[PDB]
Amino acid sequence: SIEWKLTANLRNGPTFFQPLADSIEPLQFKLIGSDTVATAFPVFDTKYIPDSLINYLFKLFNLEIESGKTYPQLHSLTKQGFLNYWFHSFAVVVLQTDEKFIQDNQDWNSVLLGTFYIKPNYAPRCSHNCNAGFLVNGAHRGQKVGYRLAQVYLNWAPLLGYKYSIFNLVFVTNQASWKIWDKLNFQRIGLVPHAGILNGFSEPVDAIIYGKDLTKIEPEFLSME
Amino acid sequence: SIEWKLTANLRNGPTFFQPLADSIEPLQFKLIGSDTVATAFPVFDTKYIPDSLINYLFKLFNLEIESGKTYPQLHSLTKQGFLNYWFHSFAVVVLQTDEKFIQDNQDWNSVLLGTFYIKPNYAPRCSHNCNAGFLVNGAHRGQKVGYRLAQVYLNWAPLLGYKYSIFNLVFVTNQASWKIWDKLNFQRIGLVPHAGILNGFSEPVDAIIYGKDLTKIEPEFLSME
Ligand SMILES: O=C(O)[C@@H]1C[C@H](O)CN1
Ligand SMILES: O=C(O)[C@@H]1C[C@H](O)CN1
């Protein structure tokens, strides 16, 4: 059974464009500057992934929210709030494994590299613009996992039918993030001054708005070999 | 009773800032180039306004969505979806009257000039940025009602505690861009290319992202003289 990777089960996706593929196959690659094999898997519904992984992602996201430096959330989410938020449409999990499927009951604290969601950034007439939010497991910090996450995203977002990518709020203090977007030729299409009240900064911090055409992506960024 | 105009009854507003006033008083002014008197009224809760006015605004917003040229919505809203959308936080109705309160059972088709909502544009850490959407009654096109609505907005948004204004999608084909926002020194802080699929346009239409500092507003724009 391959229902777990069928685009026909894409929920709450773009209204005007159908997926370009009937399915999305796991995408294997090596972490940058390493022999460590990682695999990205599509998530079209939570029922196809281990409960324990969902609960670990729930906690992972709350820690990120509590640091108060990256997401506009102030308070932690409930389990159902997180399910509604992260998995409203599409998501991806990236694990340290060479398996082409996700094994139950793994040690997520070591095996989960990162996750991201993809959804429409706007209501239906502008729903060909996707948004994405990312997370890296802090145990795997410093391995350039984010860069890899961004690449999987460029490979897969167009397959769901999206034509353009928008990040609404990349804080200028979030250097990890904007350097990746800069390096991958995401345009800075906007700048919100004093946008975020962030933990650890006494003054409000500016956010950059990133855009990228998903129909003309540079082949070298799609390649993870 | 003045509950209907107390900022203490403000639902779902900014998280870090309190309102700058205890109350919001009706703002009276004349339509530009005319001796017609208009009154702007605050709406903190729908219970304070007439059912027939709410029903008229519901159908008015659905007409605008059906035109398919200005909002990202594709389908008409249900009644409850309208309530949740337009009155999630704060709203304003601007009537052709010199009364300083809203009389029941008026002919809204002639008396209602315009309405707009005001709400946080983002989750709590960035909720000092407010968003607004406007509606002009079609029967009052060509009387510069939008410009006046925009002036009411500059007067009232900061009173609720917002510090910066963001419009996410002003399509380049919407004349409000140059008839209003450009003229009131809303900066164009971003541009989303091919943002929207709009009725009557074959090519997707670009959308301007407008921002404006609400703590430092040109006083000639605040003045309704
Ligand atoms: O900037 C964005 O839109 C994503 C979602 C979250 O707000 C952080 N990054
Ligand atoms: O651009 C905005 O965000 C407001 C809401 C609607 O999209 C029209 N103007």
Curated annotation (Swiss-Prot), chains A, B:
* Enzyme Commission (EC) number: 2.3.1.271
Altering residue 174 to A: what's the impact? Answer: Causes a 40-fold reduction in the apparent kcat value
After translation, the protein is modified as follows: Not glycosylated.
Any one GO CC term of this protein is: nucleus
Q: Which domain of life is it from?
A: Eukaryota
Chain residues that bind CoA: 141-146
Q: What are the BP-aspect GO terms?
A: L-arginine biosynthetic process; proline catabolic process
Reactions catalysed, semicolon-separated, are: L-glutamate 5-semialdehyde + acetyl-CoA = N-acetyl-L-glutamate 5-semialdehyde + CoA + H(+)
| Known outcome of mutating residue 146 to A | Abolishes acetyltransferase activity
Q: Which residues make up the binding site for substrate?
A: 131, 168-169
pH-dependence annotation: Optimum pH is 8.5-9 for azetidine-2-carboxylate and 6.5-7 for (S)-1-pyrroline-5-carboxylate.
Q: Name one GO molecular function term.
A: azetidine-2-carboxylic acid acetyltransferase activity
Question: Gene3D superfamilies per the record?
Answer: 3.40.630.30
Q: Which SUPFAM superfamilies did the record assign?
A: Acyl-CoA N-acyltransferases (Nat)
- Which Pfam families does the entry link to? Acetyltransf_1
Which key words are in the record? Acyltransferase, Cytoplasm, Mitochondrion, Transferase
The main enzyme category here is transferase
Q: What is its subcellular localisation?
A: Cytoplasm; Mitochondrion
Domain named N-acetyltransferase: residues: 61-215
**Binding partners and assembly:** Homodimer.
Q: Could you say which protein family the record assigns here?
A: Belongs to the acetyltransferase family.
- What is this protein's name? N-acetyltransferase MPR1
